[PDB]
Amino acid sequence: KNAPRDALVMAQILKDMGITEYEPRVINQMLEFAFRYVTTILDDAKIYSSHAKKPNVDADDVRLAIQCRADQSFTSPPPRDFLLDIARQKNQTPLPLIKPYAGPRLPPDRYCLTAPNYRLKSLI
Amino acid sequence: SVRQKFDHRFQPQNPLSGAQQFVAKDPQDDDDLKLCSHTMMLPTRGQLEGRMIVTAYEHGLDNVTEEAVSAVVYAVENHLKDILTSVVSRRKAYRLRDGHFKYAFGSNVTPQPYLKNSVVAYNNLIESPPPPPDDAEQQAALLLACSGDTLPASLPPVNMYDLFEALQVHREVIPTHTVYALNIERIITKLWHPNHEELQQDKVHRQRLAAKEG
Amino acid sequence: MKRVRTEQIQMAVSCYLKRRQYVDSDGPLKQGLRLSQTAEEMAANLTVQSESGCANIVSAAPCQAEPQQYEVQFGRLRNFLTDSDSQHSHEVMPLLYPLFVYLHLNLVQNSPKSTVESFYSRFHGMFLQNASQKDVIEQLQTTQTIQDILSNFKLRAFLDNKYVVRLQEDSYNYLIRYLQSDNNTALCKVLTLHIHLDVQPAKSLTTICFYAFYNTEQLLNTAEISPDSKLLAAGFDNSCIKLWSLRSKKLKSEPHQVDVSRIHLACDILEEEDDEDDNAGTEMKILRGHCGPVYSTRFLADSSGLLSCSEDMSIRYWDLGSFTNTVLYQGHAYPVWDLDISPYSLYFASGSHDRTARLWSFDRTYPLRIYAGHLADVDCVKFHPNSNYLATGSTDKTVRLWSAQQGNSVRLFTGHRGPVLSLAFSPNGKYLASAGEDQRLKLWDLASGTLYKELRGHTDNITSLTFSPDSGLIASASMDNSVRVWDIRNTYCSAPADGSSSELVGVYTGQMSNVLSVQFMACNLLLVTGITQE
Amino acid sequence: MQQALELALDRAEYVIESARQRPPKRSGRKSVFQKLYDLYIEECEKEPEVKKLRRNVNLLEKLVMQETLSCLVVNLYPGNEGYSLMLRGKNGSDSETIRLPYEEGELLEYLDAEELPPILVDLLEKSQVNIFHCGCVIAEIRDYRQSSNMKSPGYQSRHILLRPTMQTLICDVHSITSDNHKWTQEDKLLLESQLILATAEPLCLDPSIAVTCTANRLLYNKQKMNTRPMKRCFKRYSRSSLNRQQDLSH
Amino acid sequence: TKKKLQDLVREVDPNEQLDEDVEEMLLQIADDFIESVVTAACQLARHRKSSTLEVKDVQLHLERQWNMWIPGFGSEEIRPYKKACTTEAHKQRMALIRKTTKK
Amino acid sequence: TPLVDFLMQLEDYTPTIPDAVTGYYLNRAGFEASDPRIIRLISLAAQKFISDIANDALQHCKMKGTASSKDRKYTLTMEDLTPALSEYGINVKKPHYFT
Amino acid sequence: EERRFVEIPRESVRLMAESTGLELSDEVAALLAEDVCYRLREATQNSSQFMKHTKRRKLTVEDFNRALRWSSVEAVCGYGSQEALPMRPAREGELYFPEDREVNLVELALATNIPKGCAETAVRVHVSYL
Amino acid sequence: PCSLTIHTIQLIQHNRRLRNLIATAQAQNXXXXXXXXXXXXXXXXXXXXXXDCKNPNAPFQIRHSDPESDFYRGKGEPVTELSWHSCRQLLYQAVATILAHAGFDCANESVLETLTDVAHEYCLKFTKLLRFAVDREARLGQTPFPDVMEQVFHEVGIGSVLSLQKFWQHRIKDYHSYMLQISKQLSEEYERIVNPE
Amino acid sequence: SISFATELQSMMYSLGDARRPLHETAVLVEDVVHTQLINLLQQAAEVSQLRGARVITPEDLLFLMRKDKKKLRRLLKYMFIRDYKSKIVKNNANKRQKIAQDFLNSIDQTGELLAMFEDXXXXXXXXXXXXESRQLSFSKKASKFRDWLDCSSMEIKPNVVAMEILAYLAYETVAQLVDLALLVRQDMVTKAGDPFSHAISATSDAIQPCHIREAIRRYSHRIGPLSPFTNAYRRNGMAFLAC
Amino acid sequence: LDCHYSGHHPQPASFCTFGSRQIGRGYYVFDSRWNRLRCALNLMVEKHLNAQL
């Protein structure tokens, strides 16, 4: 019909994640994203192959380029294992000792957003 | 319709399945690394070679060209200096040459831009055609006068908060995700500032010292 | 190469338990009851575990072999405690006697003969006036070898038990300030192993009130009402928070020199504007200062101030004296999703995109505890009514109850088909509800840690929950633009219009677009919020 | 508000006092923790000899002599010697390790907090011995750091309990699932849930903030000496710091 | 010669000085930096079946990832700029689309 | 001829960017958009940023056809924008035709 | 137990690679296709996460760019118009392209178009009994 | 001056077209009635008057900002709020105006819609830098530079706020003067060629 | 194999250096200049390809240096002096200037370039008796330079005129690097508490290699506007110290 | 006229491990600090196993 196949693929992905409705040009955005990713990966593969002094590129060059790209760009938070270690090293410190309060106590002034610039002059 | 609602969701690839396998070698006394966390110093050329060879081994290599050691030493020093520059920029003025080259990191010249005198001095004292001592002394006095800081103040030594803010802002000084992600979390767990009670004891000790001085 | 079976899991669990010696040498089907306890026995357990080890040995003790120091440390301490003219110098005086006795006794077990005599001579003449302590002070005089300490009767109870001392918090900090000032390692070892300081603090059906926002235009994100029902706050996709006065009074700020939602140049003067009485109040205020979409705003227990979290991975406390951000908590490197405050405003926690939650105090600008263990984003968080346990929902379809003070996972429920979005405790501290994209509402039994009840009927994402102050009814809001109240108490009914029959009490789907919040108040009140169009 | 807090604090103080004085009383094999609780119960009944002193102060160090228990020993030699680990054998035998320097203080941090390292367990299981006791592993710390008597014992045998931590549980989950079978995410979560349910401390589910006040008091007193300045001061004079200082003279 | 962090700090700004925690953190970061860079260079060497870790591997990795150029190691490896030409089919479709747009 | 101080000059510089746009952008970061000086300065910075790109694009367009006159319509194509943008680490790669 | 996951064809990857000026083999095309599909799904999940916390169903381009920014990836520019961009088939009937009409700048440069501000927010209370 | 410069560019292009047609036709040889004197693009309604009797190039003249003025004190009224839908249209028009001022006169829709988003990104980043600097100052109570604006200007490549005056001088005022001179010269040439004396 | 180590060791002292310049310093400076020249040549090659000439004409090199006005103005003045000198040795000797003015007239749109162009020494410093060691020394210079560059195995090549520009660019590179090293040394040894000492700076005892390494590290960083809070926008390349 | 599809969720050809290494069974590290201690302990357990025979 009107659409090409790639637009249908992207719409199907959006459906899969559970997106009911959306702005139209989102699909164009996704197409440009995929195109740019592929082109940059190929360009990097060219350099990594020419470094190895060999003819037209192959699987190994592409995989190396993808590894280098992923070591930089497509990121996400560290895993559970590292977080558990830092958590263990953090929880050992003591907590404050509760006492009756006339409302919660704020931290000291030297560490609060209540300091005027010293250059500025004040007026009466 | 509902049952087949969560069957095509995203399944992130676990990052550990591609973890490196560790093989035990002979425990010898000569085979030691000296990670900089242990020895509170930068590693010398010789010390770096021991661990470079050890790492190379697990990848099926023979030895290092001995020009690589120099490059790695230079790069490590360069990278540390880059981070230090990022941290310094956030709490001191500086100048610019050619638009990016930052050299004079004191807080001195910084002509206040809203003074008619500053506007005039900027045009001349900055664009110098590319110095008798009396003239230089006069012009230094002028630059200090225009800066506007009548009663300059200073900061305590560099602490954790400065590093945290610097790293959060710039973030192009650590392009690699692995180095940044693991160390930022560590930095978070070392943030600290004295609480009310400690400040009270500081008050008391100051009273004590003042008294014993009188 | 096939998926394991249900029983095989129990088999592996039993194998683990046997290997680590948790159960007897047989089938412990008798065992598996100790899943709860009362206050006094919890105190007993924690007291037994507190004295079942030493908190610090390896680093707390000195390593240099220089016996001359034991004199210097004690001498400096005595000099400092003497010239002091404070009320603390009083309260921290009693420690000298156990310190001397234990330092001498430890010298004996490893010290050549030269040192001990000089030590006894240099300080002994201050533990005489009291009678109860002259006995042992004199007894020590005739003591050289280890057989002295084991043989004698009075030395023994000292050697094999700890001395008690009572201090205030201020006094203990008085000792710590000195201890950290310089090398005092030997004294730290004595305090760690032998002395036992004790620090304690110094001295007739329901009625619905509904709210609607008109001019929002896909920007309103959340809203809330304070406990005393006098304020209404909301957050927006464009970073900003707006506040309304429910009562007939106006909102007016008071003088304040500093504001972060403002920029001054070098050529400005800080002056408190006097052309101000012209305003004399207004019904609405805009709070500014986040640089990203806001996702939660919570009130304090006593409606004193406001707290909020934003996409810019920051948490800000707003002072309602001046309606200005005055504190800023920075403890995250990724966007913060949720926030929550403890029953009496003692703590507050926060879930984040970084797969973890963190504990905070209102008087320190840095996290205190970290609860790692979830596999993905921590989207929901709620305190327990007693403010000692913590529940957190995650996109991995799991819910974990945590131990606030200690910080380890104590429970882990499973069964949801999709991510979780809300949580709620009943004020009797017995059950925990949770809802998510699956469109099922599960109540869990905390003590047994097993499914207790399942409710169905909503047809779209459930995004809020709440109990009545008597665990009577549980109200839910869904993405279908509906509000349904429920009853779980034995009172049964026969109204099976859908899956759940006898619990579904009332349904309210009037003219209303997306819902925002649901609450309860003193007497059969159920406040609601959301946007509408008609 | 202030009134409610004062009520809760009074309740917590009362509960602490009564639990200290009037403990309540709660098989072929009796747990090590059961024996600890019982030795605690006994010590309450007795009276002390000296005024201003208590008896129930070292439940472990006392419950060591009362029978044989398999422990893990740590040797802390003086000077720049290092440290080493020993493992008593079934045959009145022994084994010991290389002497590791005092700079690589990775293990000492674990010992300093009474937390079971995860590297230890993977091997201790391979060594077919029953040194575990309800997850925890008892360890003995011998140190010749300070002594000039030239005797036979020349060390101060301290005992401590290395409790397991959330790291150990995740390692266990990883270990059990590495069997020939397949495991799906749901199944791993089920296994973890069962393990957590089995070995978790009992819950004091009760709606009153007296509970949290009591818990805060007890924990604070447990760990009131781990402030950041304390640890900085300890680290400032530790042996590795001294070894660094000597180099600076040149 | 011995090297300390303050020695590097002096190069950037003589008058500044850090706390102790910052000193620990910077060394930890340096450890991680080395552990990553050397591994990456070793893999680049592994790519071309080479037996020895040559410097040009480190040069390539530093230039491509960390945008770092260490200056004193020659110019034996500088790629000569190419034409970067396109293929027949591509130009064919571009001409086709130009035609379809013309009328 | 005159050399008035900076704030006197700034009141004469009119920015192409409207004030409401700068207010929109200031409100995102949490600032009250009422000070005219700040609005002016931010708008001027944005204008400079765009102007530099425009200049580079026009020069690149001039150089394109040299080998192989003045009266011609100057139009802007992606092949002129890409090198100009790349000066600022912006990598433009856009598809041409889909399927 | 049987499930499906749409993936792009080998032909699309080869067509993209053509613009670069490289002729790709058979295995490489499928490798790249699977990698690109994984990245698309990751980015889409991340984008949906931001929308989850706003109580709105439509997904904007701002959400996508925000998710890309947090994942340390350059952003996509030129699709924030809130108006449809129809596609065009060529003569044969297999190639498509987007309409890109030339525009005379001076007309837009010399034109006054006053915009309408927004209206202030307000809240009405609405009680009921049941 | 921006609008008038665009106008002058159009007039100059028109004049060159007329000049080339006429010169070529009468080099080869109403073909007897040349066009006609076009028409100046009426100078602005401010720059004109500035082009009163005080002739501000006088000596002993001082001009300074009144410190009581609203502008100097930095006082005004909150700008009009407007949604994203309309903000994008206004920024689109501004980008078109800048492109026209540059020297172009037409372009592709994709190029313009892309430059709009590039500007969007730049504005967001500038304001975020401002946010962070303001918070840091509010905590520590001091700034590296005299004020936060100077800091942010330094951190985005620009040298200092005092570089804006040079930028304006070179890029706007002198550009307008250059265009006027060229327009007058070409108009005089056309006048000399239409009606020889 | 060739080298300029001894030649540069004398060039440097002209630019405010010690009586006896260090050797390995010049060794490293040689490689720095070589690398910058090679990369500049590649960029020029990319420039020419648009015009479709397959020769690196002076217009291509003059195009890369179209941003910094002061350096461009100095380049134009040097071109004037070179055409004038060649005239005195012998288009009517306005060839270089003709080319430069033609190109700048071609590209400019605001009259900003022309400003640098329009605005007694060449006779006051010429009253002696010069009648051909100068020409021979210049020939030695150019001949050695062409060989040292090794500019043959390239799909495109520079012509006769552009080589003069390239040599001038190498000299300017050397001067700029010396200047930056001097600024870095000025910064390091300050330890100044008195504000006058730190302020008069707006205007061993030799330039060790560490100074040059620091200067290059510091210059390599460019402050882009879309950098903050990310790393997805790096100007992947190398700053040209001379251009 | 069907969009090509596979029976399993896609996987990335190469991804980003965080520099982690697996010590034994079911334990991962990120810093190479336990290398010395692990070698020592492995030898200890080796010998302690040898002697029981």
Numbering used by the authors:
A (entry chain E): 10 to 133
B (entry chain J): 104 to 233, 248 to 331
C (entry chain B): 1 to 203, 255 to 585
D (entry chain C): 1 to 26, 31 to 254
E (entry chain G): 59 to 161
F (entry chain H): 114 to 181, 188 to 218
G (entry chain F): 5 to 134
H (entry chain D): 59 to 87, 96 to 117, 119 to 264
What do the authors of the reporting publication say about this deposited model?
The SAGA complex is a regulatory hub involved in gene regulation, chromatin modification, DNA damage repair and signaling. Human SAGA is a 20-subunit, 1.4-MDa complex with five functional modules: a scaffolding core that includes TBP-associated factors (TAFs); a TRRAP (Transformation/Transcription domain Associated Protein) containing a phosphoinositide-3-kinase (PI3K)-related pseudoprotein kinase (ΨPIKK); a histone acetyltransferase (HAT); a deubiquitinase (DUB) and a metazoan-specific splicing (SPL) module. SAGA regulates gene expression by interacting with enhancer-bound activators, recruiting the transcriptional machinery and modifying promoter-proximal chromatin and is known to be involved also in DNA damage repair and signaling. Here we present the cryogenic-electron microscopy (cryo-EM) structure of human SAGA (hSAGA) and show how the arrangement of distinct structural elements results in a globally divergent organization from that of yeast, with a different interface tethering the core module to the TRRAP subunit, resulting in a dramatically altered geometry of functional elements and with the integration of a metazoan-specific splicing module.
Single-particle negative stain showed the presence of a central core domain sitting atop the distinct cradle-shaped TRRAP module, with a Y-shaped density flexibly tethered to the core domain proximal to the TRRAP cradle. The lack of a stabilizing TAF6L HEAT–TAF5L NTD interaction probably contributes to increased flexibility of the TAF6L HEAT repeat domain, a critical platform for HAT and SPL module integration. Furthermore, the local repositioning of the TAF5L NTD exposes the TAF6L interface to allow for SPL module incorporation in hSAGA. While our EM structure revealed the site of incorporation of the SPL module, very little is yet known about its function or how its components partition between SAGA and the U2 small nuclear ribonucleoprotein. The SPL module subunits, SF3B3 and SF3B5, are shared with the metazoan spliceosomal SF3b core complex within the U2 small nuclear ribonucleoprotein. Therefore, SF3B3/SF3B5 cannot be simultaneously incorporated into hSAGA and the SF3b SPL complex.
